[PDB]
Amino acid sequence: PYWAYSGAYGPEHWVTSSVSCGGRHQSPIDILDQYARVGEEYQELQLDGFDNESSNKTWMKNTGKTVAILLKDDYFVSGAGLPGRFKAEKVEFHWGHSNGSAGSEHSINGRRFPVEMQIFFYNPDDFDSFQTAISENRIIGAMAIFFQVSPRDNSALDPIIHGLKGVVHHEKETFLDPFVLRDLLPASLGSYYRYTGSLTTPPCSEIVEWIVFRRPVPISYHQLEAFYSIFTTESVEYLRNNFRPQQRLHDRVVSKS
Secondary structure (H helix, E strand, O other): OOOOOOHHHOHHHHHHHOHHHHOOOOOOOEEOHHHOEOOOOOOOOEEEOOOOEOOOOOEEEEOOOOEEEEOOOOOEEEOOOOOOOEEEEEEEEEEOOOOOOOOOOOEEOOEOOOEEEEEEEEOOOOOOOHHHHHHOOOOEEEEEEEEEEEOOOOHHHHHHHHHHHHOOOOOOEEEOOOOEHHHHOOOOOOOEEEEEEOOOOOOOOOOEEEEEEOOOEEEEHHHHHHHHOOEEEOOEEEOOOOOOOOOOOOOOOOEEO
């Protein structure tokens, strides 16, 4: 079903086509740190494969709603209260309008960031593929990483920024220079929030265990310009402010490491 980030098919109308979008446990949310429960003693995030350079087969697409990276290497996460081990499938990005304006889906104490990168994972022990996993409404995992402006270019982002320059037009695809996935995550992985939520685009399935990192990854204002230059169609517009409005916590508790 067609959906958009504004207009008659905008987020307040998603529920018409995708019923889950009007559910009680939706994402993204604002995280009030005061109300985050230190909760269980949880195994620290265990990352496998994140230090390896990416395959030259890894590629990036302008979907018109985001820019997605389809991962071609094996990356695994466990710990942080997730049930078992999860395998990374893809990366997507949400950003603002100009000059570092708010673009994140999540926030912390009302504070937004100019970009939010989300990495999506499925449990390979249960299914052969990420698509299989979503079709069955089983638990999938997602990490949310904020970017924050810094005076210098973040060299770790170079291959991603270069990719953006190659996918300005809707539907365009490009291979990416090798990057190290670990280096697109915060320097410390020790500080994060956990909650149960949903996909932030239709079908808005309420099956996502979110890990939201508290500390951001740096990006320069110059690098941000590569996001602001992306186009989307349907009629052409800049692809900007591509974030879903925040959803109510309701009966949920957010945990923190």
